[PDB]
Amino acid sequence: EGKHFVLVHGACHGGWSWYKLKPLLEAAGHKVTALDLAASGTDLRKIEELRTLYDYTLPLMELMESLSADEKVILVGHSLGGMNLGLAMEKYPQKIYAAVFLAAFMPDSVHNSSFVLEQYNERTPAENWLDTQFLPYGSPEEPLTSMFFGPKFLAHKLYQLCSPEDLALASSLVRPSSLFMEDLSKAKYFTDERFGSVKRVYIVCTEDKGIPEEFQRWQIDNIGVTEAIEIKGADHMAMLCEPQKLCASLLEIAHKYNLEHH
Amino acid sequence: EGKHFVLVHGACHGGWSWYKLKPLLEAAGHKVTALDLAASGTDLRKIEELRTLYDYTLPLMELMESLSADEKVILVGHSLGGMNLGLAMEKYPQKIYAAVFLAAFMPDSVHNSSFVLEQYNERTPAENWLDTQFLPYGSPEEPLTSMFFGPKFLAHKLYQLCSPEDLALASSLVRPSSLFMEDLSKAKYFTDERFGSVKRVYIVCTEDKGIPEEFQRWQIDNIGVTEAIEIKGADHMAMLCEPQKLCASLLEIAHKYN
Ligand SMILES: O=C(O)c1ccccc1O
Ligand SMILES: O=C(O)c1ccccc1O
Ligand SMILES: O=C(O)c1ccccc1O
Structure with missing residues (x-):
């Protein structure tokens, strides 16, 4: 009856x-x-060392590949983590009971894999990034951009409802990342037969300022989902401001699967 | 007017x-x-790149060297951090209001710099390290042992009075370290002239199981301190199980000494 939860930040x-x-x-x-x-x-790897979504998702892929024949999991991807989840779902659909997208960017198997990220940009004003750093580390032929959240963006757009302790912790641990637009904008890593075969559950964080609730709902209404859950009163970091409510939703998700199968 | 606290883990x-x-x-x-x-x-540096205590403390040394001419600070070293403090106190003693040793390994300028670590190891039976992982990464002529705390050692030796959340955070962030015995046991990097000129404050954590209060007291009794303070009920990780009390204590230290 127990389940194995793979959490993707x-x-x-x-x-x-x-x-x-x-x-x-x-x-x-x-x-x-x-x-x-x-x-x-x-x-210990460096961001300038990653050029694609795959390179960034490698640890997740390795875990999936390493799974036993009789071993399945429930994936939970937070924000960008939803993109990482897509990759795992496309390659290992039969080892995933379900994919849970927590206030995440949830790809689709219709448009280019960058679609969801594209829509976000077109629906989000450049003023919302505040002090987020966007530095180039690629080349003129093969451009690459890194993304590093600043203290203001974190405090006022991601941790607005979290504690100063949470803010101090994040400030000592956050590292530069990337959206890998160049790679995703010109590819379709998700197909309906594989990616689209995995059950999708979206958990909406109502008070999210980094990825507003309105955009979270757009994804659900656009790419569609199997089930939409909501955590009222949670900002972008639901696992930090509402861990118990998050736990309860994840437990219920694992349980609902057991009723239709186990 | 506020003071600059340099916290060393x-x-x-x-x-x-x-x-x-x-x-x-x-x-x-x-x-x-x-x-x-x-x-x-x-x-982004790897432990195998650290051959001496200096290389490990480099970040702290760089911070001190960058300090302004009239820029002073309060050092706070937790456990092993006490050894990193020693190096900073020896090189930039003028830029320190006071060095605070939180349940730390506090060196002296009398014996070899490995004096305190050797006493601790002799007193610590192998079983007490539980699942801690010790592995060599040097040459036969220049041996180097690595030290990586395991989950059982953390739970029952360092966080027994902390929350399951704190424990899970630690298990997700801990990385291999080293006691740098060889390097420390070959010279007296600390002198009473420089190191000894800095005021020492030791904060005893009474419920510490990693570095027992008995040993913390022995360090106070054998090396001397300007002031001995304690946080009753705190395990090894005082900044996690008793942050408010630690804070209050640090505030008085900032007040008392200049
Ligand atoms: O990954 C995130 O948490 C995130 C948050 C805001 C905007 C873009 C992002 O990728
Ligand atoms: O640095 C520590 O917290 C520590 C704890 C127990 C034994 C040796 C150590 O260096
Ligand atoms: O002190 C210990 O080494 C210990 C080990 C396992 C379980 C509980 C404990 O206190």
């Missing part, structure tokens, strides 16, 4: 981001892996 | 370990810098 964060949720899921009798993606958390 | 930890104390100190109008030492926290 968003941009500039790491496995450490789930430290409040991990204990809760484990106390419920479940297994939890709070992965560090490439150049995230304490992974 | 212990082995396998990083600047993130001070996330509960930092806000509190700042709320009091103080400046706080919780840096990552070499190959610690998010530092």
Whole structure:
């Protein structure tokens, strides 16, 4: 009856981001892996070393590939983590009970894989980034851009409802990331037969200022989902301001699967 | 008017370990810098690149060297961080109001710099390290052992009085470190002229199981301190189980000494 939860952090964060949720899921009798993606958390790789979404998702892919024949998991992707999830779903659809998108960018198997990120940009004013740093590290023929959240963007757009302790923790751990637009804008890594075969659950964080609720709902209404959950009163970092409510939703998700199957 | 607190983490930890104390100190109008030492926290350096204590403390040394001519600070070293403090006190003693040793390994300018670490190891039976992982990464003529705390050692030796959240955070961020025995056991890097001129304050954490209070007291009794303070009920990780009390204590230190 127990389940294995693979938690995938968003941009500039790491496995450490789930430290409040991990204990809760484990106390419920479940297994939890709070992965560090490439150049995230304490992974010694550098951002200038990553050129594609795949390079960044490698730790997730490796875990998936390493899974046993009789071993399945529930993926939970926070924000950018939803893009990482897509890659795992396309390659290992039969090993995923379901994919949970927490206030994330949820790709689709219709348009280019950059679609969701594209819509976000076109629906989000440049003023919202505040002090976020966007530095180039690619080439004129093969351009690459890094993204590093600043203290203001973090405090007023991502952690607005979190505590100063949460803010201090993030400030000592955040590292530069990337949206990998160049790579995703000219490819279609998600197909309806594979990616689209995995059950999708979206968890809306109502008070999100980084990825506003309105855009979270647009994705659900656009690419569609199997089930939409909501955590009222949570900002972008739901695992930090509402870990218990997040836990309860994830437990119910694992349970609903057991009713239709187990 | 506020003071500048330089928080130095212990082995396998990083600047993130001070996330509960930092806000509190700042709320009091103080400046706080919780840096990552070499190959610690998010530092992109690897432990195998650290051959001596200096290389490990480099980040702290760089911070001191960058300090203004009339820029002073308060050093706070947790556990092993006490050894990193020694190097800063020996090189930039004039730029320090006082060095605070939080349940730390506090060196002296009398014996070899490895004096305190050797006493601790002799007193610490192998079983007490639990699942801690020790691995060599040097040459036969220049051996180097690495030290990486495991989950059981953390839970029952360092965080037994902390929350499951704190434990999960640590298990997700800890990285291999080293005690740098060889390097430390070959010279007296600390002198009473420089190192000894800096005021020493030791904060005893009574419930510490990693570095027992018995040993913390022995360091006070055998090397001497300007002031001995304690936080009753705190395990090894005082900044996690008793941040408010730690904060209050640090505030008095900032007040008392200049
Ligand atoms: O990954 C995130 O948390 C994120 C937040 C705001 C905007 C873009 C992002 O990728
Ligand atoms: O740095 C620590 O926290 C520590 C704890 C126990 C034993 C040796 C150590 O360096
Ligand atoms: O002190 C210990 O080494 C210890 C080890 C395992 C479980 C509980 C404990 O106190």
